[model samples]
Every structure is written in C-alpha cells, then in structure tokens.
Target: MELKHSISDYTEAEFLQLVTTICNADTSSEEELVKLVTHFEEMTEHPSGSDLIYYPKEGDDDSPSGIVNTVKQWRAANGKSGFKQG
Candidate 1:
C-alpha cells in the first residue's frame, strides 16, 4: 500500500498501455504498471475483475508478475533470485 503516488489520474487506455508494456517489459518498468494497477484497484467499482489482470495466473509464469516474481522458471533457475521484499 504505497501512498507516495507513482502513477495517478491515468485513463483506461493508459492503463492498457501499461498492461501491454509490462507484458513485454523487463523488471524495471514493472513498477509503473504496479502503480497504475493500484490506482485502478482502489478507484474501480469492480476490483475483482481488474485484479485478474494485475494478478494473473501464477502457474503461467510467462504471463509475468512484474519484477518481484519475474517468470517462475527464471526465478527457480537463477538461484531463486528475485525482487527483494520490502
């Protein structure tokens, strides 16, 4: 629950851009997506459906989990290294 705004007042299309970006982006750009997703989750009336997009199927590691998770296989192979817990 970060309060310091990273992304704010973004449009649905903007969110979509982030979605597409994160879908292909490296771990660096993932934070921007997370910020946008947080806003969408907080402001939207139906958070559940939106959550599905942000938090996709965990089994599908190629689906991406931002930086923290990366791809599950990448994590497992790389000494299980990943984004540090804050």
Candidate 2:
C-alpha cells in the first residue's frame, strides 16, 4: 500500500491543520474515538470497524502479524484494499 504522503511529507502547518480538524470534529476524547471507530464499522464502506490497524505486538516474530491479519480480514470482509501495513 502506497501513501500519497508520509507523515514527514506534511509540513508543520499541515499537520496542525489535520490535528485541529480532528480535535474540532465530533471526536474530542477517547470515547469519541471509539464511537467514531464504531460508526465507521457500521458504514462498512471502507477501512472501518475492526478493520482499523493498531500496531502489532512488541517483539512479535511474524513481522506485524496482527496488523496484517487485521487488514487482511478487513479487506476480505469489506471488499476493499490499499491499506498500508507499516
């Protein structure tokens, strides 16, 4: 999966703009994050729900198995692709 821009690709101003958008959006807390995640899950239109990838366990041997599995299952279940593994 290729990203159009990496985190470093964004200027400080651009990053701050993104942060501001998220902060001002309906998601303002951890609970809101969960709700937002759940909302995406229900939509089933893209990489949402349990499809969102968290980092794999520390020192795990299978090279980001958790992330791979999460994304694989998400794509398979949702019929979409183009998610980054790292």
Candidate 3:
C-alpha cells in the first residue's frame, strides 16, 4: 500500500505504523518488501541501504520498533526531519 502522505509529512505514530506494516508482511513477499523498502529509501537516509530496515547490524537494536526508533534517532542527530509530530 502507498503511503497517504510524504514521509516528512507523517507523524511518528504513522511512520511506526508503516514499519509495522512492513514487519507484518508475508516472508514470501520479497517483491512487496523490495517496493516498500524502495519507497522507504526514497524518504530517509541509511548508511547500510534499505536493507538496514530488515537486517540487524552489530550493536544495533533488532526489534521492529527499535529499528524504527534507531532511524528516528539517526535522522534527528543528522539534522534531518524525523516526522511532522510536535
């Protein structure tokens, strides 16, 4: 499914929901995962490419929500907008 708003326009909860959507997707849906991650890559920055969302890095949090939080923290620290939340 397409995002209703641009990544920057989403609230934190909305973005987390997006991550949740990706997490809950069927394991066999590699095509779907690729498209969704591509869309995600179009929105934010990640050193390890879009695969960072799915694969865990050494010393990085591996939980779905933790992964989202990691991205949120990285964005904020890197002077990027995290979301449209107040």
Candidate 4:
C-alpha cells in the first residue's frame, strides 16, 4: 500500500482533506489521526515520525496541530474561511 504522494507532498485537495479529517475535536481525533498515520506508514512502509505526526502518548503533541495551523494561516491568507475551532 505504498502511498502515491509523500507526507509533505500533498496536493491542495489532499492537504485539505487531511486537515478536515484530523482537525476535528470530536470522536477522539488524535487516536483517529494515529490510525491514519499508521495507515500512511503502511502505505509508505515507514514511520512519518512521532515528531511530525504524534503517537498520542501522554504529553504528546496533537498530531495535526502544526499542519492545521499552517492550513488555517494559508486559508486566511488566501481569503478562505478560517477553520472553525469547534
């Protein structure tokens, strides 16, 4: 299940989908993101790194925070609606 694109090499649509899917606060999003990261790792056959996409351990970073912030900044800068923080 090798991925078609590298982790940082997403098309805009792919990026947005990742953002929306992982940014959600509902349904244990961090865990869900871990599942995604695991799948992506399966595809790439390696770790994208716990530093980049958190492993959801105690005191660990939220997986999508960095990227989501970047995305939100990009959205505001591009005149798109900022991410709903809910």
- Winner by TM-score between candidate 4 and candidate 2: 4
Q: Global CA lDDT of candidate 3, please?
A: 0.67
Task: Evaluate residue 16 in candidate 4 and report its C-alpha lDDT on the 0 to 100 scale.
Answer: 42
| Worst 10 contiguous positions by lDDT, candidate 3 | 43-52
TM-score result, candidate 2: 0.29
| Highest TM-score against the true fold, candidate | 3
TM-score of candidate 4 on Cα atoms, chains taken together: 0.31
TM-score of each: 0.33, 0.29, 0.73, 0.31
Those runs of model 1 whose alpha carbons end farther than 4 Å from true positions after fitting are 1-11, 26-28, 54-86
Cα displacement (Å) at residue 61, model 1 = 16
> How does residue 21 of candidate 2 score in lDDT?
33
Candidate 2 regions off by >4 Å? 1-26, 45-48, 55-86
Q: How accurate is candidate 2 locally (lDDT)?
A: 0.39
Error of 3 at 50 (Å): 3.1
lDDT per residue, candidate 2, 36-69, as tens digits? 4443343334343353433333543222243334
Task: Give model 1's TM-score versus the native structure.
Answer: 0.33
How far residue 34's Cα lies from its native spot in candidate 3, in Å, is: 1.8
lDDT of 4 at 29: 52
Better of 2 and 4 by lDDT: 4
